[PDB]
């Protein structure tokens, strides 16, 4: 199965306190392994998965100065951006960045990405090809001109096709019993009546890794999305995930519905029917 | 491993 390394960065300006709040996290697939928070006391990149802990002091020193240096960039970006859009200095504003690498089942490179947002809207993004930018805006256009003039794309392309995909491989190996494990979902079904003529069936999936699953209700062997509601999949908190899928049915005939559970850790897709 | 030493300013 394919994999990704992604970093997420958020800075929020705060007029009348001294510095933007800055929070950085790194993930491989669905498992964070690093964090930094400009308000915490250590002022260091912190490990959040057992397999990055084996990296030595050079790596931690290096990751911590890159992430501080990154929050320094965002300090400048907040003031530039307020100027581009002529905004009041009285208001709090948000800069977000995320960049990363996917590789395929054969762990070769599939794609890199680098995206940037101001106040929760698209600003500029590096296109697939890693040579080129799209800009949401005329403010974003002048940044794009800045970035073309300074050959930002080139460095990012070398990072993403090189170091990044390389370090993803290295992590996949060191963390293999954690990153290369599948936790097959524990499933179950509940029934509650809604109305005279109606009852709801909720099909459960718990303790799975990774987060991708597809939950579908069939009716007599056939897809049923009319009156089907999936909740957002959600962290259990222990590194695993949870999702349920519900169907609203003409009651009496509970047995006519089958829940179908697909997940990487399931040799074969799973079928579930209410037996009372 | 992060891109570095640091990102270009907007």
């Amino acid at each position, epitope marked *: 199965g394919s994999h990704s390394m992604r970093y997420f960065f958020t800075s929020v300006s705060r007029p009348g306190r001294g510095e933007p709040r800055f929070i950085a996290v790194g993930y491989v697939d669905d498992t964070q392994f690093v964090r930094f928070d400009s308000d915490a006391a250590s002022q260091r990149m912190e490990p959040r998965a057992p397999w990055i802990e084996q990296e030595g002091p050079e790596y931690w*020193d*290096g*990751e911590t*100065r*890159k992430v*501080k*240096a990154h929050s*320094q960039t965002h*300090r*400048v970006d907040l003031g530039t951006l307020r100027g581009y859009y002529n905004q009041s200095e009285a208001g709090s504003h948000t800069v977000q960045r995320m960049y990363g690498c996917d590789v395929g089942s054969d762990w070769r490179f599939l794609r890199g990405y680098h995206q940037y947002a101001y106040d929760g809207k698209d600003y500029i993004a590096l296109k697939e090809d890693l040579r080129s930018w799209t800009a949401a805006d005329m403010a974003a256009q002048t940044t794009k001109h800045k970035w073309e*003039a*300074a*050959h930002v794309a080139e*460095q990012l392309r*070398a*990072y993403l096709e090189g*170091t990044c995909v390389e370090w993803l491989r290295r992590y996949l190996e060191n963390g293999k019993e954690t990153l290369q494990r599948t936790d097959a979902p524990k499933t179950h079904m509940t029934h509650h009546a809604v109305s005279d003529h109606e009852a709801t069936l909720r099909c459960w999936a718990l303790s799975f890794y990774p987060a991708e699953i597809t939950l579908t209700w069939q009716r007599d062997g056939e897809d049923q999305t009319q009156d089907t509601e999936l909740v957002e999949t959600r962290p259990a908190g222990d590194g695993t995930f949870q999702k349920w899928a519900a169907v609203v049915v003409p009651s009496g005939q509970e047995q006519r519905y089958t829940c179908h559970v697909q997940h990487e850790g399931l040799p074969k897709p799973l079928t579930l029917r209410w037996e009372p | 491993r992060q*891109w*570095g*030493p*640091d990102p*270009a*300013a907007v």
Partner: T-cell receptor
Amino acid sequence: EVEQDPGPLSVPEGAIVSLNCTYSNSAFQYFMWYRQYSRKGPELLMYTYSSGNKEDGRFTAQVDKSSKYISLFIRDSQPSDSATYLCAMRGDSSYKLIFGSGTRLLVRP
Amino acid sequence: GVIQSPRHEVTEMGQQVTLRCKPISGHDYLFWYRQTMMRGLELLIYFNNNVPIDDSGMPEDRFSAKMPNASFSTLKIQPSEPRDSAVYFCASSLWEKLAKNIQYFGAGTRLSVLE
């Protein structure tokens, strides 16, 4: 660490000069050469991002990340090329440069 | 370009020595180096927006560097010692020049701390 022979090299004008450095830390990714006249500051010459070979005028700089070995060649050397030459390098985590100790070059008129 | 002072300092060990640097207007990175007249430079420290980024090369003890505002940096030695004699170079740049490995150097402070 960056090992560099101190010399001095003394060469007759017109000669091809070869200068180099070796290092031990893989993850050095940017390699550079500086020229420094005596009593002055270092002046950037040539700069090669992991990228083998880089020609400019009489100067060519090269990098072999396998043998961790780096070189600068100066064709048709001249008296004004007389200077100490220093190699410098970094990775991608800091702008901190590590220099070799320099090679003093004399080109005899 | 970058302006340093003093260009020259001769003093007795024991004394506080203070070196100063004004980067090129607009440059938001600044570097302090030292060269002991035998070898290559070493980086002592650099700053980005007046914040110290890499400190690696600062001596464990009698050395401290400040950047109270964007146009001004100091390096302090207290007390000074003969092994401190060196040419101290300041330099500054911008991202777009550092991505091509270019920085701008001051003319240097030449320091002899004598016994």
